[PDB]
């Protein structure tokens, strides 16, 4: 057993408190770098010329933000999709003025999270599990890729990537709605069905299983002590639960098969959020939401407004106001 | 939705935010739980489609809690160990979330908004070089209000001459 | 055409309204399109010199076919709705247009993504099947039960 | 910045009072026999 052999054995060990793994060998350093840079930037970075018009936006705490307003501000529109590592800058001060931290953090993060998914496969394999947890995780990951990488590629600038902050996230959403009418896009609608539905089935499932807990405890103790970790007996009555649910809707809307049920629980939100991710990722190439502006006309030819037209008025407000100093020409073409 | 953004600045409201956490967290739990059970199943049949290998009256767990716990302990650092707590928590997160959003909306009934940060406004009023995403989003809101109010609130008979419409350069 | 000196027109931000410099100095178009200065096209390159866009060529050498082409392309930008209403998201119904580039880009991003998912699915499944646990965990030989506690 | 002067203590107490509560419960649980 030479040294490389033992190194590989430790890396892939199923006994480490946290699994390292080969994916983890990339994950750990990239995630540490992204995290460290993020915390430092979020606390102390100077304002960032996000839209490349020498109009620097302050994102950090020390420069006048709170938790809700603060952000790591996207790199300059002057940079576009150009790679801006620290060593391309003349100085750290230039690097900061132009939003370098943003690129360091999002590239390291995306690599890191990709390896996080890989790692989920990897440990599933080392433990003799079936492998598809990582596929469930692909949905939020794909979303992150959508707002941090794909959308910037489609619009030609990381300055249009989502900001690393709460309010910056809202800014991103609002401008997105202006430029894509995302609410009227069936993929975003599927995404909403996914997360609303996921919340619903989450509560539903939780409540039904909780409802059918087999009595194992007294009134003066938590029912949870009624389940012992690793016990072979199922801790609730799935037949009683199925009976209740079938009666609540009708006999056949219900799952009596736990495997089929849990698969449904995985699939509904995962698929929905996949479609959300693809909504952002295809709206990245400006294939946008349904446009029914002035779709309904009377006999003379008067426009008869629908709610779609009111939406359009709102969108117009967003459009004309966003990045109020950045456009010189009448069409916002990216 | 768009009205609540423009007039109430609803996204800034911590009760809405708790709502979002409850809903997205619920979705997260739904997905992660489903996937976990489905990928820690015991082999209880010979079929490659593993759905048939379950019996509603069976006394045994169909998946391994111990293996799932080790997996998540090593992936994420922590894991459920108690099934009862897991499922109660699956009730608790989205339900609590939706309740909080309800509280926020009750505030909005009175225009009791989380619309501004006063310190932000004092600084920005005094200092025309101070900019954050918060003030940017207020500009968006002002846009929404001005451009949507006449057709959205027709009973007010708003007439906003072109020259008073807030607009940035060119657009 | 109206008499502007486009090389010296200062835009509201202080950057040139029509022309400015790229981060490495090249003369490029101003406004948001500063992000797109890497663009190269047969209609634009005649105006290009060693230092980027040439102000003299811009003053004296712009042919009508170039004007035509710029107007055409400006008015056929790859922006449009799912129901093929051409233009920005707030545009009214009138033009039936969605660019082939949008259709092809979006279609193939969707397909490439679901194929990434497919790769994860069948790769993980292939590993699990080659090792013999794709159908679940053996109750009589559960691997984790033979592993020491994490803590 | 011109922040609400009571913010600080409000936050401090907001953290401290319920946390302490939990800590008390936890510690007296651990000190119980078995």
């Amino acid at each position: 057993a030479n040294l490389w052999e033992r190194f590989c054995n430790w890396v892939t060990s199923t006994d480490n408190r946290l699994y390292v793994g080969w994916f983890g060998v990339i994950m750990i350093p990239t995630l540490l770098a992204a995290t460290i840079c993020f915390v430092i930037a979020f606390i102390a970075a100077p304002p960032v010329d996000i839209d490349g018009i020498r109009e620097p936006v302050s994102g950090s705490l020390l420069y006048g933000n709170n938790i809700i307003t603060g952000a790591v501000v996207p790199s300059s529109n002057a940079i576009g999709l150009h790679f801006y590592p620290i060593w391309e800058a003349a100085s750290l001060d230039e690097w900061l003025y132009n939003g370098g931290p943003y690129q360091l953090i999002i590239f390291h993060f995306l690599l890191g999270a990709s390896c996080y998914m890989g790692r989920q496969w990897e440990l599933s394999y080392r433990l003799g599990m079936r492998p598809w947890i990582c596929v469930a995780y692909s949905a939020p990951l794909a979303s992150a890729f959508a707002v941090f990488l794909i959308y910037p590629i489609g619009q030609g600038s990381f300055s249009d990537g989502m900001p690393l902050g709460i309010s910056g996230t809202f800014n991103f959403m609002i401008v997105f709605q202006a430029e894509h009418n995302i609410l009227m896009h069936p993929f975003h609608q599927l995404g909403v069905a996914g997360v609303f539905g996921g919340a619903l089935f989450c509560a539903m499932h939780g409540s039904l299983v909780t409802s059918s807990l087999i009595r194992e405890t007294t009134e003066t103790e938590s029912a949870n002590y009624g389940y012992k970790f690793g016990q072979e007996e199922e801790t609730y009555n799935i037949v009683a639960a199925h009976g209740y649910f079938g009666r609540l809707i009708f006999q056949y809307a219900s799952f009596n098969n736990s495997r089929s049920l849990h698969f449904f629980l995985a699939a509904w939100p995962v698929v929905g959020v996949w479609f959300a991710a693809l909504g952002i990722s295809t709206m990245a190439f400006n294939l946008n939401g349904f446009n029914f502006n002035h779709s309904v006309i009377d006999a003379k030819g008067n426009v008869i407004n629908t709610w779609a037209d009111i939406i359009n008025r709102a969108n117009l407000g967003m459009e004309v106001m966003h990045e109020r100093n950045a456009h010189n020409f009448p069409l916002d073409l990216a | 939705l768009l009205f609540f953004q423009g007039f109430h600045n609803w996204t800034l409201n911590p009760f809405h935010m708790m709502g979002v956490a409850g809903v997205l967290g619920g979705a997260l739990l739904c997905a992660i739980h489903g996937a976990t059970v489905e990928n820690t199943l015991f082999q209880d049949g010979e079929g490659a489609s593993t759905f048939r290998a379950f019996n509603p009256t069976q006394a045994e767990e169909t998946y391994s809690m111990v293996t799932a716990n080790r997996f998540w302990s090593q992936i994420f650092g922590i894991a459920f160990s108690n099934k009862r707590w897991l499922h109660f928590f699956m009730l608790f997160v989205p339900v609590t979330g939706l309740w909080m959003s309800a509280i926020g909306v009750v505030g909005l009934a009175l225009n009791l908004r989380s619309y501004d940060f006063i310190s932000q406004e004092i600084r920005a009023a005094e200092d025309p070089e101070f900019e954050t995403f918060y003030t940017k989003n207020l500009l968006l809101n002002e846009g929404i209000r001005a451009w949507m109010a006449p057709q959205d609130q027709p009973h007010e008979n708003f007439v906003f001459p072109e020259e008073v419409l807030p607009r940035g350069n060119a657009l | 055409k109206l008499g502007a000196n486009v090389g010296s027109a200062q835009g509201p931000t202080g950057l040139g309204k029509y022309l400015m410099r790229s981060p490495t100095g090249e003369i490029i178009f101003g406004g948001e399109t500063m992000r797109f200065w890497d663009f190269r096209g047969p209609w634009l390159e005649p105006l290009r010199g060693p230092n980027g866009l040439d102000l003299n060529k811009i003053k004296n050498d712009i042919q009508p076919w170039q004007e035509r082409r710029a107007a055409e392309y400006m008015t056929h930008a790859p922006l449009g709705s799912l129901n093929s209403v051409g233009g920005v998201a707030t545009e009214i119904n009138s033009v039936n247009f969605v660019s082939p580039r949008s259709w092809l880009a979006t279609s193939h991003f969707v397909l490439a993504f679901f194929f990434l998912v497919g790769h994860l699915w069948h790769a993980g499944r292939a590993r699990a099947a080659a090792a013999g646990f794709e159908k679940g965990i053996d109750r009589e030989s559960e691997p984790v039960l033979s592993m020491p506690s994490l803590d | 910045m011109e922040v609400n002067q009571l913010g600080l203590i409000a936050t401090a107490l907001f953290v401290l009072v319920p946390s302490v509560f939990l800590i008390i419960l936890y510690v007296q649980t651990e000190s119980q026999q078995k």
Partner: peptide
């Protein structure tokens, strides 16, 4: 002092991550 507060609460949360992971009550099979 606002900044100090934000950073303090955050720091506490990270410390808590540390204890909740490495000094958890270990799960035990019966």
């Amino acid at each position: 002092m606002e900044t100090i507060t934000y950073v303090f609460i955050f720091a506490c949360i990270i410390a808590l991550f540390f204890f909740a992971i490495f000094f958890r009550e270990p799960p035990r099979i019966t």
